[PDB]
Structures are given as structure tokens and as C-alpha cells.
CSV table of C-alpha atoms and ligand atoms in Angstrom, one decimal:
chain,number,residue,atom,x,y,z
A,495,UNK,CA,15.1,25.0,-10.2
A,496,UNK,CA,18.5,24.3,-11.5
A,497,UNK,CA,19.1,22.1,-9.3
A,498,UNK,CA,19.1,17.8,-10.1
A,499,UNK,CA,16.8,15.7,-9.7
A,500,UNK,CA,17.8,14.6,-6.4
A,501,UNK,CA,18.1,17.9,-4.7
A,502,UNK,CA,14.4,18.9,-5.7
A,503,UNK,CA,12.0,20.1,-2.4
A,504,UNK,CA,9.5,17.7,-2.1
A,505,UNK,CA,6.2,17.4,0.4
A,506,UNK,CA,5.9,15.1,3.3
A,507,UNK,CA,2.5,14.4,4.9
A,508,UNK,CA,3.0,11.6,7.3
A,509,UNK,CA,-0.1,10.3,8.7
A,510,UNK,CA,0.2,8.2,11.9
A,511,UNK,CA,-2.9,5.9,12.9
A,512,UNK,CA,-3.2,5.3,17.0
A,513,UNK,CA,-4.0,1.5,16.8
A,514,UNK,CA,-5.5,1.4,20.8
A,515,UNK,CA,-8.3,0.0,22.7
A,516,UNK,CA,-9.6,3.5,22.9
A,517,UNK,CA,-13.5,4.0,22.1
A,518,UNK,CA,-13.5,4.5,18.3
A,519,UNK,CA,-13.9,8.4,16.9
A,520,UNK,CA,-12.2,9.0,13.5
A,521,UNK,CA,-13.0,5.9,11.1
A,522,UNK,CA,-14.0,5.2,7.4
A,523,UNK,CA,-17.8,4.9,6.2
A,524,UNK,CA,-19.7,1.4,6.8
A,525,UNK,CA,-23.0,1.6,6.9
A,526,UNK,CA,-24.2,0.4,10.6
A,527,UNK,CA,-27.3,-2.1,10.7
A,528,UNK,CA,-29.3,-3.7,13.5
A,529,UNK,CA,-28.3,-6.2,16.4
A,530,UNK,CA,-29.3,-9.6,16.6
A,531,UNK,CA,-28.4,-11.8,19.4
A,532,UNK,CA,-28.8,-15.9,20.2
A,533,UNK,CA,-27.7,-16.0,16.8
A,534,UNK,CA,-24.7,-17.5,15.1
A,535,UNK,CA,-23.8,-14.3,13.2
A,536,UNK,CA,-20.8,-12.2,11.4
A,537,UNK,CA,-20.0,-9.1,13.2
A,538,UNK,CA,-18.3,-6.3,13.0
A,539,UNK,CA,-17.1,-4.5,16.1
A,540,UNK,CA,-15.3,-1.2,15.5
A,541,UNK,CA,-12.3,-2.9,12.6
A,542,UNK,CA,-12.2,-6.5,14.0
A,543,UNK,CA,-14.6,-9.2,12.3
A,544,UNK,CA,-15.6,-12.4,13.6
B,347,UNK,CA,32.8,-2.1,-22.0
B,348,UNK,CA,36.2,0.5,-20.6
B,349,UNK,CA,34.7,1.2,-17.0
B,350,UNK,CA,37.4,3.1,-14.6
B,351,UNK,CA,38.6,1.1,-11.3
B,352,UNK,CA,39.9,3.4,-8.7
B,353,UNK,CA,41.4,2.0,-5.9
B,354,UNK,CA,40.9,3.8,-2.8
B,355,UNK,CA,42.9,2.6,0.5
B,356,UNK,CA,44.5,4.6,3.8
B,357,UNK,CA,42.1,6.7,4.8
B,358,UNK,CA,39.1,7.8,6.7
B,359,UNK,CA,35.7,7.8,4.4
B,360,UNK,CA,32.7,9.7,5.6
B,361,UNK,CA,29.8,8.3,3.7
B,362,UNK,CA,27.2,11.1,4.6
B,363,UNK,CA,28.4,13.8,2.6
B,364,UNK,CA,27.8,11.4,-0.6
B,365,UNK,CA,24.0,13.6,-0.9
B,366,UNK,CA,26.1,16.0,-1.2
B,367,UNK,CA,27.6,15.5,-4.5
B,368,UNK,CA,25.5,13.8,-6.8
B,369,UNK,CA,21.8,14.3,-7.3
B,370,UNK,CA,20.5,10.4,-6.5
B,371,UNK,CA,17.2,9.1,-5.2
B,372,UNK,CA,18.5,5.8,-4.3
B,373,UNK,CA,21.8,4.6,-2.4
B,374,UNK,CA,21.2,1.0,-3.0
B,375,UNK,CA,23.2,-1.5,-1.6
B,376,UNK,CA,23.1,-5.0,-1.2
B,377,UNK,CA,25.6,-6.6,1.4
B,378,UNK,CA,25.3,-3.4,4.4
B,379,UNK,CA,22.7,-0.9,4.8
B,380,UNK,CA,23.6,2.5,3.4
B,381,UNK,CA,23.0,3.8,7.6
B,382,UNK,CA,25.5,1.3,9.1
B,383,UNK,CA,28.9,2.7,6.7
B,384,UNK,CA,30.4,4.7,9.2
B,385,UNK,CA,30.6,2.6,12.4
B,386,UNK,CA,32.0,-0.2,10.5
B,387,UNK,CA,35.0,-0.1,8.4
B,388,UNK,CA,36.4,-2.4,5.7
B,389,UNK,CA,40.0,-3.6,3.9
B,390,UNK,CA,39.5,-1.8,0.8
B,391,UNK,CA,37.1,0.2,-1.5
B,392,UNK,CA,36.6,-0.2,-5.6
B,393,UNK,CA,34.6,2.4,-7.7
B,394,UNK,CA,33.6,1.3,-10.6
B,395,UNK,CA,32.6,4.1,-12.8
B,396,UNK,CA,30.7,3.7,-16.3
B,397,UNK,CA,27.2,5.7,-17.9
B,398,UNK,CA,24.7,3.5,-19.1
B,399,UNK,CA,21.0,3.6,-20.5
B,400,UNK,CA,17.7,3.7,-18.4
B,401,UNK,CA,16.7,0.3,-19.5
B,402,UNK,CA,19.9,-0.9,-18.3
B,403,UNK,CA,20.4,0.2,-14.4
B,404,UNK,CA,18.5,-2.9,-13.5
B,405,UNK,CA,21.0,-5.5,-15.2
B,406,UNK,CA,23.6,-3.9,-12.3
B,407,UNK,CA,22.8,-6.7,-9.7
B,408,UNK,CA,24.2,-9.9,-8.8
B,409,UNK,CA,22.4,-12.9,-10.9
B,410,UNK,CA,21.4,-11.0,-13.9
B,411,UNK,CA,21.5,-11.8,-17.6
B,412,UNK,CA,20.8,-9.2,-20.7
B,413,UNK,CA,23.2,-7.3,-22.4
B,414,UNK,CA,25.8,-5.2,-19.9
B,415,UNK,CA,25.7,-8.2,-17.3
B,416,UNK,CA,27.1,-11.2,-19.6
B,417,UNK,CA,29.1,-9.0,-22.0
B,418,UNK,CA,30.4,-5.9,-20.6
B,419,UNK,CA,30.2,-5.3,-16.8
B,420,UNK,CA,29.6,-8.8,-14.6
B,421,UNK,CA,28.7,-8.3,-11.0
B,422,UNK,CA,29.6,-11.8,-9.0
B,423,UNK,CA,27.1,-13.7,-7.1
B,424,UNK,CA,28.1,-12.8,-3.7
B,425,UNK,CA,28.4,-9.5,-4.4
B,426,UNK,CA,28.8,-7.4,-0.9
B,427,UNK,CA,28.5,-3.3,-2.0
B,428,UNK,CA,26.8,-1.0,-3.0
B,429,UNK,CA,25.6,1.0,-6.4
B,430,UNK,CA,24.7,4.5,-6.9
B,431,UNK,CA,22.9,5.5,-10.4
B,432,UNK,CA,21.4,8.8,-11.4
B,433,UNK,CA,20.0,10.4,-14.3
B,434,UNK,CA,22.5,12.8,-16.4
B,435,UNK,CA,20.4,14.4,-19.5
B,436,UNK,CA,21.4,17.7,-18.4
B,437,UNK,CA,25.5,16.8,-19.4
B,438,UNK,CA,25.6,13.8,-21.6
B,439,UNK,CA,23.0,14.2,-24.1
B,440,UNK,CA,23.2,16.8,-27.3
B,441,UNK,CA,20.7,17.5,-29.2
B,442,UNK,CA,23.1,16.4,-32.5
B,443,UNK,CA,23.5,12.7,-31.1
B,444,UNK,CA,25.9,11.3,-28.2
B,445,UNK,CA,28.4,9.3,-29.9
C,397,UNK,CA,9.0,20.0,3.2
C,398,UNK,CA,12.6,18.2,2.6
C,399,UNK,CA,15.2,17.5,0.0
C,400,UNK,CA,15.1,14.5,-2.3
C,401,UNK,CA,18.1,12.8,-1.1
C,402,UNK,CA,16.2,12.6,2.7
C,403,UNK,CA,13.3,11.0,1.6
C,404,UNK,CA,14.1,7.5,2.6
C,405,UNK,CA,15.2,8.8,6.0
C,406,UNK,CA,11.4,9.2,6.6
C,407,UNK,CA,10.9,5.7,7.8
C,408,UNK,CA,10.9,3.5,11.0
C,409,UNK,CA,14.3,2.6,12.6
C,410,UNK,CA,16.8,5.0,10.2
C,411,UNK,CA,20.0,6.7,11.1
C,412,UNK,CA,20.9,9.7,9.8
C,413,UNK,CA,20.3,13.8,9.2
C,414,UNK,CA,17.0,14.3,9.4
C,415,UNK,CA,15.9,10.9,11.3
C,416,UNK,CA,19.1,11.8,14.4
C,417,UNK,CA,18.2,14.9,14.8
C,418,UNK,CA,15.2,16.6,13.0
C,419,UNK,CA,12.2,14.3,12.9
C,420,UNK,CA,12.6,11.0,14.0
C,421,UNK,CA,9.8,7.9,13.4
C,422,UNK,CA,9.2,5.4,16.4
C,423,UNK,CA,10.4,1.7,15.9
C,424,UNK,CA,6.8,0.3,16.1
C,425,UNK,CA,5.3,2.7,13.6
C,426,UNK,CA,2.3,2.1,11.8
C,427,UNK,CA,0.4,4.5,9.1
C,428,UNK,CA,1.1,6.1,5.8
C,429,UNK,CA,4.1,8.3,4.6
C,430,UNK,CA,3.2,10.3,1.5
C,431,UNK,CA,5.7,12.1,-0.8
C,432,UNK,CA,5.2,14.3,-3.5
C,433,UNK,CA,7.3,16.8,-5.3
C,434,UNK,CA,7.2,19.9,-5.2
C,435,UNK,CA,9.0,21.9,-7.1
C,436,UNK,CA,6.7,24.2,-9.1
C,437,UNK,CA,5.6,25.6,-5.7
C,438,UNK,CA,8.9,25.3,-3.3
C,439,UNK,CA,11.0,26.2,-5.9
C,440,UNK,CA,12.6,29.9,-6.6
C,441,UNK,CA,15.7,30.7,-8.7
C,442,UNK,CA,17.0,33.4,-5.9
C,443,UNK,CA,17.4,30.7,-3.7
C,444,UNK,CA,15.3,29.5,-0.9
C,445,UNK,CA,15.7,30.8,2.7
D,601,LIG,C1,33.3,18.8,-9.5
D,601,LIG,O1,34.4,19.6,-10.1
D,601,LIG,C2,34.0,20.8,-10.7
D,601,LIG,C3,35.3,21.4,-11.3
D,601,LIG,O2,36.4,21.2,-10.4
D,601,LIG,C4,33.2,21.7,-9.8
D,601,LIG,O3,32.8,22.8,-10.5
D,601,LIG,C5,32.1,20.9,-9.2
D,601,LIG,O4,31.4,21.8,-8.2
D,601,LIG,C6,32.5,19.6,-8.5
D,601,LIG,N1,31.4,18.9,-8.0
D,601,LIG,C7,31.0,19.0,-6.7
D,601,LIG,C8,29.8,18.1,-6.4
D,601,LIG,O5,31.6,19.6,-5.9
């Protein structure tokens, strides 16, 4: 604890994100609604909009 | 304002055991990268050594106006280097006032 | 858990102690680094071993 400021411990948590064409499993919280079709729409496909 | 040149020549410098000595966050530099110092080698190597306020570690850097850039330590504009700053409470500072 | 000093050898394309021969970051890496300190917790006055 004597130590400077610059010799302190310190805690890494490195998070690494596989950016793939994989089917999607671990993702953040949208809501999902219903699909239309024959339509000019906004979509959302697993990230990538459109 | 009486900042210490040392002028350091003939030799083989090892820049990795610089951690080692002071306790720094940042080795920033400005003409290299602080991982490329010990393939390449230079002609010769200035230290510049002065303690300043916390306000005032910003004002070291090429193109800079306040107080210690125009008046008492001037960095040039194509300034190829590096600077080292870290924090020293712990030996000069009293509790009677630093003069 | 590493020193303060190696911090900025956690990142893509660095040369060094930690980053040569400890844990090394690919060139095309994407996703977070987080950093906190620690020394209330990873901190003893014997000396950690
Ligand atoms: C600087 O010199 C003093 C006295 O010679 C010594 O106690 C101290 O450990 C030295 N600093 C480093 C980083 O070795």
C-alpha cells in the first residue's frame, strides 16, 4: 500500500465480442414484434438494420 | 525556470526498465511509440528535468501557450521525444508550505 | 490482476512484458477492456505473493 501510484494492482476484465455469421445467442434486450412482408419496411435482423 | 539538462551519449539504453523506477501511468511520446525504443537507436539523448503543478503538465507539448510554455520551459514545434510526468505529494509537499 | 505501469500493454498490436509473453490481444480485436483499481482488496503491507 506504500507503493506509488503507478505500481498499484489493478483489475482487468477484458471482454471480447465474436462478430461472426453464427446464428445469434447472447445479445441485448429489443423487444421482438410481428413480420410483415410485400411491404416496404424497416427491419431489424439480428444487429444490422435496413 | 532552472530545469537540469543531462546529456547522455556512448552507451546502450534499455528503455523497459523505465516502470521500474518511477511510479507513471503514462509514457507519452510524441515523435516514436514508447514500444519501438529499443530496436531503433538515435545520435543523442537530453533529460530535461523540472517539478511542476497539475494544472500545468498539459502546457508540456509542442504548440502550447499559458504560463510554463512562453515564459519558462518552450517545447519546439517539431518536437520528436518523449515526456514522462507523475504525481509526487508523498516527497514534495509539507504540510508548512513548499517554498 | 496487473500493475499500473502494464495497463496500456492491454491493447491490440503492443510490444512488451505482459503483451510478448503473458497475455497477448489479436491485431483485429474488437470489444471492451475494463480497468479498475484495486488496491483496497489486492493490496497487503507483508507483500503480495
Ligand atoms: C534512488 O536513490 C536512492 C538513494 O540512492 C535509493 O534509495 C532509491 O531506491 C533509488 N531509486 C530507485 C528507483 O532505485
Amino acid at each position: 500500500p506504500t507503493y506509488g501510484v503507478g505500481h498499484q494492482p489493478y483489475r482487468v476484465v477484458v471482454l471480447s465480442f465474436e462478430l461472426l455469421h453464427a446464428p445469434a445467442t447472447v445479445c441485448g434486450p429489443k423487444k421482438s414484434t410481428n413480420l410483415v412482408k410485400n411491404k416496404c419496411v424497416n427491419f431489424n435482423f439480428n444487429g444490422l438494420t435496413g | 525556470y532552472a530545469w537540469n539538462r543531462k546529456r547522455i551519449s556512448n552507451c546502450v539504453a534499455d528503455y523497459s526498465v523505465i516502470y521500474n523506477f518511477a511510479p507513471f501511468f503514462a509514457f507519452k511520446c510524441y515523435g516514436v511509440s514508447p514500444t519501438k525504443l529499443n530496436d531503433l537507436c538515435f545520435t543523442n539523448v537530453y533529460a530535461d528535468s523540472f517539478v511542476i503543478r497539475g494544472n500545468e503538465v498539459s502546457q508540456i507539448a509542442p504548440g502550447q501557450t499559458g504560463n510554463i510554455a512562453d515564459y519558462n520551459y518552450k517545447l519546439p514545434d517539431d518536437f520528436t521525444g518523449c515526456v514522462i510526468a507523475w504525481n509526487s505529494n508523498k516527497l514534495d509537499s509539507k504540510p508548512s508550505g513548499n517554498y
